[PDB]
Amino acid sequence: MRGSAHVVILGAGTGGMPAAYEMKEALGSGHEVTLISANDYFQFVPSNPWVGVGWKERDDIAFPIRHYVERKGIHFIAQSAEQIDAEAQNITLADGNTVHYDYLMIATGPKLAFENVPGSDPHEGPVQAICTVDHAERAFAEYQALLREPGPIVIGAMAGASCFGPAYEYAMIVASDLKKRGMRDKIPSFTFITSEPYIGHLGIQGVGDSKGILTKGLKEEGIEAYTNCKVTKVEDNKMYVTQVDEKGETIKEMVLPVKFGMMIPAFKGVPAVAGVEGLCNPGGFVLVDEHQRSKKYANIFAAGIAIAIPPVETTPVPTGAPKTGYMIESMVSAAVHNIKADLEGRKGEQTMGTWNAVCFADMGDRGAAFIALPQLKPRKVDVFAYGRWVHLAKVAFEKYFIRKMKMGVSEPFYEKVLFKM
Amino acid sequence: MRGSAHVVILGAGTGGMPAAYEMKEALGSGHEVTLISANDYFQFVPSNPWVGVGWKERDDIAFPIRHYVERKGIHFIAQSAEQIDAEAQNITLADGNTVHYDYLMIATGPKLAFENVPGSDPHEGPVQAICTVDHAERAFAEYQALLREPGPIVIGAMAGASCFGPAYEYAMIVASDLKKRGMRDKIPSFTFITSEPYIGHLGIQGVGDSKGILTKGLKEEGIEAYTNCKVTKVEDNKMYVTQVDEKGETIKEMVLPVKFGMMIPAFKGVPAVAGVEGLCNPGGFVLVDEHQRSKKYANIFAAGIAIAIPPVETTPVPTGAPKTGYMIESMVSAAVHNIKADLEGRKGEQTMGTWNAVCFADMGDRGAAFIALPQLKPRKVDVFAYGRWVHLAKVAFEKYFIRKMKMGVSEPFYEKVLFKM
Numbered sequence: 001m002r003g004s005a006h007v008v009i010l011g012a013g014t015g016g017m018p019a020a021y022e023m024k025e026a027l028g029s030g031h032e033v034t035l036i037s038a039n040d041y042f043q044f045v046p047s048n049p050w051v052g053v054g055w056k057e058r059d060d061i062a063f064p065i066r067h068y069v070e071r072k073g074i075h076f077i078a079q080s081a082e083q084i085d086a087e088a089q090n091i092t093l094a095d096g097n098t099v100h101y102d103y104l105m106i107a108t109g110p111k112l113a114f115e116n117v118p119g120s121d122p123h124e125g126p127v128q129a130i131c132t133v134d135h136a137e138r139a140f141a142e143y144q145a146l147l148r149e150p151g152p153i154v155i156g157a158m159a160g161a162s163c164f165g166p167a168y169e170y171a172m173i174v175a176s177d178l179k180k181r182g183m184r185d186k187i188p189s190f191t192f193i194t195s196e197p198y199i200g201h202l203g204i205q206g207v208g209d210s211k212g213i214l215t216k217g218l219k220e221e222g223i224e225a226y227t228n229c230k231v232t233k234v235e236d237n238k239m240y241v242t243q244v245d246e247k248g249e250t251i252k253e254m255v256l257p258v259k260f261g262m263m264i265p266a267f268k269g270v271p272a273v274a275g276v277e278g279l280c281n282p283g284g285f286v287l288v289d290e291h292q293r294s295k296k297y298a299n300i301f302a303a304g305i306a307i308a309i310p311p312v313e314t315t316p317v318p319t320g321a322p323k324t325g326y327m328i329e330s331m332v333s334a335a336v337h338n339i340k341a342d343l344e345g346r347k348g349e350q351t352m353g354t355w356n357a358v359c360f361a362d363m364g365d366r367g368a369a370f371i372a373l374p375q376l377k378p379r380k381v382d383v384f385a386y387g388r389w390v391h392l393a394k395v396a397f398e399k400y401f402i403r404k405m406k407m408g409v410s411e412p413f414y415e416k417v418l419f420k421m
Numbered sequence: 422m423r424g425s426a427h428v429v430i431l432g433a434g435t436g437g438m439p440a441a442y443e444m445k446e447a448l449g450s451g452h453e454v455t456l457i458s459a460n461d462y463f464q465f466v467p468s469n470p471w472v473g474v475g476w477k478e479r480d481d482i483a484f485p486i487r488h489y490v491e492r493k494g495i496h497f498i499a500q501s502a503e504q505i506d507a508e509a510q511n512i513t514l515a516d517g518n519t520v521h522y523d524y525l526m527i528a529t530g531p532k533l534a535f536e537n538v539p540g541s542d543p544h545e546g547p548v549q550a551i552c553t554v555d556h557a558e559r560a561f562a563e564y565q566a567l568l569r570e571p572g573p574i575v576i577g578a579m580a581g582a583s584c585f586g587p588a589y590e591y592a593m594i595v596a597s598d599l600k601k602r603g604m605r606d607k608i609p610s611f612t613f614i615t616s617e618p619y620i621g622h623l624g625i626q627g628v629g630d631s632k633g634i635l636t637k638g639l640k641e642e643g644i645e646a647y648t649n650c651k652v653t654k655v656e657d658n659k660m661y662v663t664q665v666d667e668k669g670e671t672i673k674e675m676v677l678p679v680k681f682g683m684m685i686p687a688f689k690g691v692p693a694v695a696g697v698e699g700l701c702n703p704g705g706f707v708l709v710d711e712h713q714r715s716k717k718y719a720n721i722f723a724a725g726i727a728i729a730i731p732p733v734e735t736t737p738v739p740t741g742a743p744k745t746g747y748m749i750e751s752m753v754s755a756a757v758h759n760i761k762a763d764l765e766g767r768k769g770e771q772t773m774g775t776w777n778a779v780c781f782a783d784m785g786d787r788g789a790a791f792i793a794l795p796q797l798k799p800r801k802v803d804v805f806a807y808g809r810w811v812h813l814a815k816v817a818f819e820k821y822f823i824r825k826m827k828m829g830v831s832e833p834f835y836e837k838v839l840f841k842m
């Protein structure tokens with residue numbers, strides 16, 4: 001309302017949950033902050049691959065949101081938004097209620113576009129997914145069904161995927177778990193299928209020696225690997241795969257039987273967001289300026305996977321670049337600062353800063369991690385690392401992030417760089 | 422929500438508007454206060470009779486609510502509540518949206534029960550009303566239509582009415598206005614019909630010499646007056662009146678032609694409130710204890726005309742006792758204090774205090790006013806007064822109340838008793 005602007009944060013995930021806390025901290029008691037989300041619980045997404053193989057439980061990685069944000073003065077609505085009217089500034093919720101806003105921060109993350117590949121939906125066939133804890137629990141269930149009745153495995157990433165690390169991670173920990181169960185010798189074939197132009201491209205044109213290390217890792221585990229692949233359909237428990245060359249010409253088609261499968265899908269914008277006329281690119285991603293402000297609506301900001309980031313290369317099979325945690329938090333921090341500035345006269349000048357990708361994957365006793373910045377080579381930092389200490393760091397950061405999500409955040413975030421001082 | 426209770430005030434009138442301000446003042450920034458009302462504007466009800474004869478305009482007595490309450494941190498919803506679910510603690514609004522509450526203060530005032538008398542609705546016949554500015558504007562319109570085409574006048578109060586002062590006031594100022602227009606001699610008959618057992622009973626068994634003074638005033642103006650009357654129907658521009666004796670036996674029936682009429686209707690509780698199972702008496706009035714708390718729902722409080730107050734006498738024709746401004750404000754003050762106490766552990770002990778009725782009527786250059794307390798005789802104060810100074814006081818208080826409704830209130834209210842100190 002006038003003088004007491006109402007700020008709504010849409011989506012309670014990696015970006016939106018911190019956004020809610022930071023917004024409330026920044027605005028104070030004279031402004032209403034409402035967090036709206038489809039689920040009533042927060043989940044730590046990077047832990048999902050482990051849920052998918054049974055090394056972790058939902059209880060370990062998820063928790064109910066209400067109490068933690070309410071004790072901070074944040075209103076929580078656990079309903080999905082179905083429609084956004086950007087002119088009227090109303091959000092229509094699944095239950096039919098409407099919520100008005102003065103400022104809206106979109107942090108709705110990705111729509112998992114299973115529909116790109118007929119039959120690929122986890123509920124339609126044997127190809128599962130581990131992007132959400134719901135799906136990872138289901139993937140694990142189906143993994144247990146593979147144990148009771150061994151058959152071919154196919155793991156990888158679909159055309160248009162932007163999140164490749166987890167596919168390699170999941171394949172490695174499955175291979176590992178199979179060994180630790182003396183079941184590995186029971187698998188007739190274990191195949192890795194990716195839309196990447198080469199192993200370890202990772203949607204970022206490789207990082208450090210990702211190519212060599214991931215290639216060797218796959219071979220070490222007896223996983224046969226194909227690149228430049230798209231899946232045209234999943235049907236009758238078979239994946240129909242087309243493999244192309246540098247020019248997009250088919251060089252083979254394959255029909256792969258699948259008893260147990262997991263393919264990272266392409267991401268699009270969620271329907272409620274993509275449905276806002278003029279707000280998004282054709283993929284459903286919100287077009288924002290460097291200050292995280294919508295180019296169309298001055299009172300709509302966005303952060304996280306939900307925003308559009310222009311490609312910098314074109315691969316034989318369409319692929320995207322990942323949007324990862326540190327950059328997401330910088331987007332969030334910039335949006336909150338620039339909204340506050342709008343509320344107080346100024347134009348906020350804060351940006352998300354330099355593009356970067358940072359990923360940590362835990363294999364059990366040790367992990368792999370990379371840091372890449374900026375997006376195009378030659379880079380200022382281009383490191384891939386493997387060690388027991390990556391594992392320790394992943395474990396540490398998970399514990400930390402979950403704690404902060406319960407206790408609240410403010411100021412910036414991360415800056416766990418107190419391990420220097 | 423937990424730790425930050427949400428308080429909703431239903432109705433933005435004489436009680437509810439101050440309730441919103443006082444609630445927000447009392448609770449502070451850590452609690453949401455939402456004011457919900459059917460109209461987007463406040464109106465000063467006691468001024469309506471003057472609107473009804475054209476001595477005042479809507480612009481003089483009403484103003485839009487939003488800006489004034491919002492600048493105080495109060496959320497304003499200009500929608501009628503249609504349904505209240507006291508179990509779920511949800512209010513369904515006219516537009517279909519729902520509002521949840523932790524505490525609800527009902528200040529919905531009266532439903533004007535025109536349906537008690539078939540044909541009496543201001544839109545169904547010549548019998549108008551002046552309880553709301555919408556209706557008083559309409560009454561005035563019809564008054565102008567009487568000027569252009571003189572015919573019999575009938576003014577008064579229906580069976581079950583509880584608000585008699587305004588009927589006498591309106592009759593006097595009409596008689597007066599007719600004179601000031603040289604139109605008085607054009608009226609074939611001017612009749613006063615009341616459910617009171619005698620002139621000046623006023624629903625409170627008389628006050629001071631109200632009987633004598635009002636009787637004389639009516640005769641002075643050539644107004645013929647009947648008591649112990651109920652109107653059974655209005656039809657074909659005639660009022661069908663039945664007059665009874667002390668025992669309820671008919672002593673005559675009358676059929677009165679009406680060119681211009683105004684009868685104060687009986688009040689009931691509004692449907693959304695009356696519709697709450699177990700909340701109200703059969704009249705639709707909220708049953709509350711001395712702390713203004715609902716006897717059924719510990720988190721519902723009520724103030725103003727909306728609450729039930731037991732009768733203390735029974736008249737040949739049903740009548741009720743008025744609920745007037747000073748007592749309403751005491752109810753409001755008690756409810757706010759006791760809600761705050763609930764929020765902070767204690768049980769609030771504040772009550773509305775002694776029953777009283779206080780009314781001021783302006784006739785033009787001078788006014789009449791009464792004060793009566795407590796409800797049953799013999800009283801501690803039982804005064805009726807007439808003078809130029811009542812007029813000056815009415816004018817002063819109207820200006821004051823409207824100003825306070827724009828600038829906000831807190832602490833108690835009234836206590837304009839600084840004219841002593």
Ligand SMILES: Cc1cc2nc3c(=O)[nH]c(=O)nc-3n(C[C@H](O)[C@H](O)[C@H](O)COP(=O)(O)OP(=O)(O)OC[C@H]3O[C@@H](n4cnc5c(N)ncnc54)[C@H](O)[C@@H]3O)c2cc1C
Pocket residue numbers: 010011012013014015016036037038039045046047048049079080081082107108109110130131132163166270272303304305306323324325326328358359360361
């Ligand atoms: C398997 C996997 C592993 C990953 N590992 C890493 C990693 O190790 N390091 C790293 O930096 N990044 C990693 N990421 C990427 C990124 O950090 C996560 O995807 C992160 O969760 C993205 O944050 P987000 O806020 O944009 O979206 P999300 O965390 O997905 O949150 C979006 C929220 O919006 C809600 N929502 C969606 N639609 C609606 C709607 N219509 N109405 C209301 N709410 C809605 C969703 O329920 C969700 O709560 C990983 C991603 C995946 C999929």
Ligand SMILES: Cc1cc2nc3c(=O)[nH]c(=O)nc-3n(C[C@H](O)[C@H](O)[C@H](O)COP(=O)(O)OP(=O)(O)OC[C@H]3O[C@@H](n4cnc5c(N)ncnc54)[C@H](O)[C@@H]3O)c2cc1C
Pocket residue numbers: 431432433434435436437457458459460466467468469470500501502503528529530531551552553584587691693724725726727744745746747749779780781782
């Ligand atoms: C003609 C007249 C003259 C009077 N003169 C005096 C006087 O001189 N002195 C005195 O002390 N008292 C006087 N009174 C009596 C009393 O003070 C007023 O009636 C006063 O307005 C009552 O206050 P209230 O808050 O209970 O109800 P109201 O002032 O009627 O307010 C009720 C509010 O609730 C709203 N509402 C109703 N239903 C809903 C719904 N379902 N959802 C949302 N909102 C709803 C209404 O729009 C209204 O805004 C007079 C009354 C009348 C009718």
Ligand SMILES: CCCCCCCCCCCCO[C@@H]1O[C@H](CO)[C@@H](O[C@H]2O[C@H](CO)[C@@H](O)[C@H](O)[C@H]2O)[C@H](O)[C@H]1O
Pocket residue numbers: 164165166168169172213214216217218359360361368369370385386387
């Ligand atoms: C985080 C994003 C990346 C994607 C997800 C994860 C992919 C899975 C990782 C596969 C790597 C496994 O293969 C592993 O690689 C490194 C080589 O560099 C080897 O390790 C070698 O370098 C490390 C240090 O980095 C030394 O400590 C070690 O003594 C040496 O042998 C391991 O002997 C080999 O087993």
Ligand SMILES: CCCCCCCCCCCCO[C@@H]1O[C@H](CO)[C@@H](O[C@H]2O[C@H](CO)[C@@H](O)[C@H](O)[C@H]2O)[C@H](O)[C@H]1O
Pocket residue numbers: 585586587589590593634635637638639780781782789790791806807808
């Ligand atoms: C407020 C609630 C009451 C209901 C609404 C109003 C009803 C209308 C009022 C009718 C009274 C008119 O009648 C009027 O009464 C008083 C008598 O007491 C007279 O006034 C008499 O007493 C007053 C003081 O009170 C003296 O100042 C005056 O000199 C004296 O004549 C007026 O000469 C007479 O004209």
Ligand SMILES: [S]
Pocket residue numbers: 112129130131132135136
């Ligand atoms: S998923």
Ligand SMILES: [S]
Pocket residue numbers: 162163164165322323324
């Ligand atoms: S990712």
Ligand SMILES: [S]
Pocket residue numbers: 162163164165166202322359
């Ligand atoms: S990734």
Ligand SMILES: [S]
Pocket residue numbers: 165166322324358359360
């Ligand atoms: S990642």
Ligand SMILES: [S]
Pocket residue numbers: 377378379382
């Ligand atoms: S590079």
Ligand SMILES: [S]
Pocket residue numbers: 533550551552553556557
């Ligand atoms: S009315």
Ligand SMILES: [S]
Pocket residue numbers: 583584585586743744745
């Ligand atoms: S009244």
Ligand SMILES: [S]
Pocket residue numbers: 583584585586587623743780
């Ligand atoms: S009255």
Ligand SMILES: [S]
Pocket residue numbers: 586587743745779780781
């Ligand atoms: S009154």
Ligand SMILES: [S]
Pocket residue numbers: 798799800803
């Ligand atoms: S009395």
